[PDB]
PDB file of C-alpha atoms and ligand atoms in Angstrom:
ATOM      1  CA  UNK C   1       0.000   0.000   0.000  1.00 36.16           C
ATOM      2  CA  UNK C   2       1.580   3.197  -1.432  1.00 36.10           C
ATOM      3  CA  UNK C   3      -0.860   5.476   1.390  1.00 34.97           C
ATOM      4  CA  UNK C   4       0.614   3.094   4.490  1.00 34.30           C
ATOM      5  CA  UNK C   5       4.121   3.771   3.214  1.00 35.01           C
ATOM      6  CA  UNK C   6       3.384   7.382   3.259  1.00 36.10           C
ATOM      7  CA  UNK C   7       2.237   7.394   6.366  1.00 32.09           C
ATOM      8  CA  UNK C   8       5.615   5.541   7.429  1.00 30.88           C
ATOM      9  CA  UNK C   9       7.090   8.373   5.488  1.00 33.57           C
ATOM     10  CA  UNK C  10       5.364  10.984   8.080  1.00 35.17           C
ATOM     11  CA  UNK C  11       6.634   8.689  10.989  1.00 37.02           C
ATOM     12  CA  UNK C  12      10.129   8.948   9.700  1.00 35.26           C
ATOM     13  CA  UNK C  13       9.969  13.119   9.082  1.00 33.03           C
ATOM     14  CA  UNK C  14       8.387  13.380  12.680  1.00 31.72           C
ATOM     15  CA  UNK C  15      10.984  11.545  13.836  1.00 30.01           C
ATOM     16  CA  UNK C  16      13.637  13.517  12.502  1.00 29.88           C
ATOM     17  CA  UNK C  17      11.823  16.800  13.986  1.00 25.83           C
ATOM     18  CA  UNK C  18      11.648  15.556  17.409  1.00 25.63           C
ATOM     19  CA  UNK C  19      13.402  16.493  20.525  1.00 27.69           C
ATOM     20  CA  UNK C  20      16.111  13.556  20.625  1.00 30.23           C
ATOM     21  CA  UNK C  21      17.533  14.326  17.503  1.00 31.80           C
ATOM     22  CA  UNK C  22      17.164  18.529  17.791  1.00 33.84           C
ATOM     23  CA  UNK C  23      21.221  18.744  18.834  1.00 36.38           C
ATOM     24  CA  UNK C  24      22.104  18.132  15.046  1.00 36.32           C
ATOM     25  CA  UNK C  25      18.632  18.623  13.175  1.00 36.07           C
ATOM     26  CA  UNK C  26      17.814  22.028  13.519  1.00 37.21           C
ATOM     27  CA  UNK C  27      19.659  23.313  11.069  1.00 40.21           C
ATOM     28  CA  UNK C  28      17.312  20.936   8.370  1.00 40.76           C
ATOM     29  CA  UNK C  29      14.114  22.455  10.312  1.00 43.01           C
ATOM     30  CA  UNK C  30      13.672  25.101   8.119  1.00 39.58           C
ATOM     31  CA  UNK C  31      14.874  26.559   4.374  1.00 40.53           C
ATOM     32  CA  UNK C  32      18.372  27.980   4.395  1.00 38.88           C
ATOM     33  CA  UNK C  33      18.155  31.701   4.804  1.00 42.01           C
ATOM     34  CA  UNK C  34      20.037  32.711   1.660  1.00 42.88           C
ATOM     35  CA  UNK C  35      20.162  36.507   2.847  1.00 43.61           C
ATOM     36  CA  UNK C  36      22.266  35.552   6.480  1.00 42.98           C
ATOM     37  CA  UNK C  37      26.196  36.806   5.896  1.00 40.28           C
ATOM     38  CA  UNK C  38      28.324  34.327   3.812  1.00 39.83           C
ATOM     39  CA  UNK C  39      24.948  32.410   1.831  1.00 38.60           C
ATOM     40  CA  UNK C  40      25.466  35.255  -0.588  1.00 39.68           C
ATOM     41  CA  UNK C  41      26.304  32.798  -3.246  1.00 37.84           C
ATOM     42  CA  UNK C  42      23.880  29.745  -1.888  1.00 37.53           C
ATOM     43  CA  UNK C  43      21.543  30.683  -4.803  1.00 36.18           C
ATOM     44  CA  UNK C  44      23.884  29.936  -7.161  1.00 38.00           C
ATOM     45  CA  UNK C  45      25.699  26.821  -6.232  1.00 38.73           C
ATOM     46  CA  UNK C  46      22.424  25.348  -4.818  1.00 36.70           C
ATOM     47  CA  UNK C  47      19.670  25.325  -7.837  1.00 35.27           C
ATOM     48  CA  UNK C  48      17.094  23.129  -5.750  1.00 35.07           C
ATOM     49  CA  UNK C  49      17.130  23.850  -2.094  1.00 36.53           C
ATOM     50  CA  UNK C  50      14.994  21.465   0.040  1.00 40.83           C
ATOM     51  CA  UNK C  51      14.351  21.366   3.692  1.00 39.17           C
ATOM     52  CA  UNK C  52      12.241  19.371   6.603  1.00 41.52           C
ATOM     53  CA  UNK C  53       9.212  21.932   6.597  1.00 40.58           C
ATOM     54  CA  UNK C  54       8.964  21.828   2.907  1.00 38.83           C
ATOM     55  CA  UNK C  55       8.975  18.130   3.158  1.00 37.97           C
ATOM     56  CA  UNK C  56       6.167  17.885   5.414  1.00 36.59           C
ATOM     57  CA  UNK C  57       4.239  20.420   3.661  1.00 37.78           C
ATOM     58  CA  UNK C  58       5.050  18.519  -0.069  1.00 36.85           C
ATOM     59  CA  UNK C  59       3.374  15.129   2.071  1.00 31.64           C
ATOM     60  CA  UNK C  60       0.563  17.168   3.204  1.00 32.02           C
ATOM     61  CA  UNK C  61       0.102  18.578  -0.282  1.00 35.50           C
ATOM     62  CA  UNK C  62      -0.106  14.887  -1.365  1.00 38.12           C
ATOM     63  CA  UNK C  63       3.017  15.715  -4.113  1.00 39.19           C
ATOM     64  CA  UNK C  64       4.748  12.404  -3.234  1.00 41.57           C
ATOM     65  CA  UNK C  65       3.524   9.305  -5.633  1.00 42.53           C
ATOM     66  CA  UNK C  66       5.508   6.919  -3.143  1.00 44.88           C
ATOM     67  CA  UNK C  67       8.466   6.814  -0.348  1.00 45.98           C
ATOM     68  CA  UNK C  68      11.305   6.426  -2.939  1.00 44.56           C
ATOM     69  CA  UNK C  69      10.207  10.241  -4.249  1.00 44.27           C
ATOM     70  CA  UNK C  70       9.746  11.152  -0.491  1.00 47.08           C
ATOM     71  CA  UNK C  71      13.412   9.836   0.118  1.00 48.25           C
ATOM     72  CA  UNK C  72      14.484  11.558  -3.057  1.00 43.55           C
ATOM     73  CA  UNK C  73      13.787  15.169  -1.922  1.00 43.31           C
ATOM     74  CA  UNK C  74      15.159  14.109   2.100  1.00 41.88           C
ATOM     75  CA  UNK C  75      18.742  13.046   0.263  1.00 39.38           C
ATOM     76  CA  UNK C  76      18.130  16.102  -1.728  1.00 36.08           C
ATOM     77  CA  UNK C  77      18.078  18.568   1.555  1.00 33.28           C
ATOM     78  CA  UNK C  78      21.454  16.281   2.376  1.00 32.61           C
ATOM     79  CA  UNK C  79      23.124  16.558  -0.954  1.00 30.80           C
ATOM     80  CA  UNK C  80      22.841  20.462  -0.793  1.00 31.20           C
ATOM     81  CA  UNK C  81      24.753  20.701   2.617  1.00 30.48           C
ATOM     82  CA  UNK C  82      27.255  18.104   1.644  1.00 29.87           C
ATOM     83  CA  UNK C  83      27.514  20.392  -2.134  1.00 28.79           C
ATOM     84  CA  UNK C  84      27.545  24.018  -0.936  1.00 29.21           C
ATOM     85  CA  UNK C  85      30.017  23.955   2.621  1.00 27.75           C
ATOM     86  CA  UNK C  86      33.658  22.234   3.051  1.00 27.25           C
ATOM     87  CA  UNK C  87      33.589  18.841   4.235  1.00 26.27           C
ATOM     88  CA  UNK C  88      34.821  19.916   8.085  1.00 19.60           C
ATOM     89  CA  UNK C  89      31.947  22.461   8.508  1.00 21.22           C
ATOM     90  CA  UNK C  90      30.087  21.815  12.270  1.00 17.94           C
ATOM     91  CA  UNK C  91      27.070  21.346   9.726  1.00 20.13           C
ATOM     92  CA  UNK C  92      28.082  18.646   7.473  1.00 22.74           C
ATOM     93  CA  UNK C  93      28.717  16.340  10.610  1.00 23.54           C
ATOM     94  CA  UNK C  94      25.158  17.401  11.695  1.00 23.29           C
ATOM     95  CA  UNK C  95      23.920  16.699   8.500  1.00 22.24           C
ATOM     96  CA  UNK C  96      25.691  13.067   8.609  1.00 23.67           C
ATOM     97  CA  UNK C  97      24.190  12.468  12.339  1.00 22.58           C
ATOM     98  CA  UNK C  98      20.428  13.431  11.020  1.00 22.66           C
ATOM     99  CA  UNK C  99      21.144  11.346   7.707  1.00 21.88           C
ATOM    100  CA  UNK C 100      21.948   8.377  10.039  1.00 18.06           C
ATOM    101  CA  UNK C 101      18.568   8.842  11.603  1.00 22.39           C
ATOM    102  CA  UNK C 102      17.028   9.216   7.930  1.00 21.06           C
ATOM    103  CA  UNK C 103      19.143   6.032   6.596  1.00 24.63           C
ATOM    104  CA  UNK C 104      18.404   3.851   9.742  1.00 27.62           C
ATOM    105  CA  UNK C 105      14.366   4.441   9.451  1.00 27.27           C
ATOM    106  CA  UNK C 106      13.965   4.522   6.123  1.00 29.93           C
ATOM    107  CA  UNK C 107      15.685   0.911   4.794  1.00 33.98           C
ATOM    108  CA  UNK C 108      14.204  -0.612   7.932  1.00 33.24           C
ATOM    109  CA  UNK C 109       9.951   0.583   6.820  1.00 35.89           C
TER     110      UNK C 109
HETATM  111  C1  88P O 201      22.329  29.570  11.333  1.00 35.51           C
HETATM  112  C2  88P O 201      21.302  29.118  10.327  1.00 35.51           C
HETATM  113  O1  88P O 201      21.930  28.257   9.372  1.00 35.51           O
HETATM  114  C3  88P O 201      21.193  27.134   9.096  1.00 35.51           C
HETATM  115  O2  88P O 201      20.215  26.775   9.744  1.00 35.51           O
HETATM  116  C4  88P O 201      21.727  26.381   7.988  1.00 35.51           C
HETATM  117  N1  88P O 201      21.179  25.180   7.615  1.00 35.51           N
HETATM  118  C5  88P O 201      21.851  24.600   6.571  1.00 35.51           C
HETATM  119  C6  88P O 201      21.453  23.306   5.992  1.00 35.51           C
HETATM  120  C7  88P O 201      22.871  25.463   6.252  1.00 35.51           C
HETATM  121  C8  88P O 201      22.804  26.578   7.136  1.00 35.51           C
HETATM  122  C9  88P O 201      23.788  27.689   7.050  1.00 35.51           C
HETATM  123  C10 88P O 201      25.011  27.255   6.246  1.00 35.51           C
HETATM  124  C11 88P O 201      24.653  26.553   4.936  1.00 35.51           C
HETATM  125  C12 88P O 201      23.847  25.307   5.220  1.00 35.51           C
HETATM  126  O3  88P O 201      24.038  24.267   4.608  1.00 35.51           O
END
């Protein structure tokens, strides 16, 4: 059922909101704020930018056909940290951490 793996596709995003994981995820809560000093060039390295609120809004919206398009725009919002900053920024090892969460849940539904 492509509606039940949706649903575990909500269970996964909540989980990756919640308070256990908020050390490293906050940074994923919301969409990059491209005018904040040094993200003057974000807009040009990163042509799709994707983030946890816009994920739960896209599976409220219904614009996931299954959980492999769900995943898609998830690895998305952790292909544009990994792209834009150098690999020792404090948020690519945040990113890693929240992708371990993502990772864990998602092969295991
Ligand atoms: C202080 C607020 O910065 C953020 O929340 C935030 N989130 C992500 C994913 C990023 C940033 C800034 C650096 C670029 C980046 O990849």
């Amino acid at each position: 059922s492509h509606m039940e793996q949706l649903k575990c596709c909500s269970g996964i995003l909540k989980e990756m909101f919640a308070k256990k994981h908020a050390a490293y995820a906050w940074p994923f809560y919301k969409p990059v704020d491209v005018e904040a000093l040094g993200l003057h060039d974000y807009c040009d390295i990163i042509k799709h930018p994707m983030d946890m609120s816009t994920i739960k809004s896209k599976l409220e919206a219904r614009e996931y056909r299954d959980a492999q398009e769900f995943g898609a725009d998830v690895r998305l919002m952790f292909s544009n940290c990994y792209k834009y900053n150098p690999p020792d920024h404090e948020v690519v090892a945040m990113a890693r951490k929240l992708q371990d969460v993502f990772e864990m849940r998602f092969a295991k539904m």
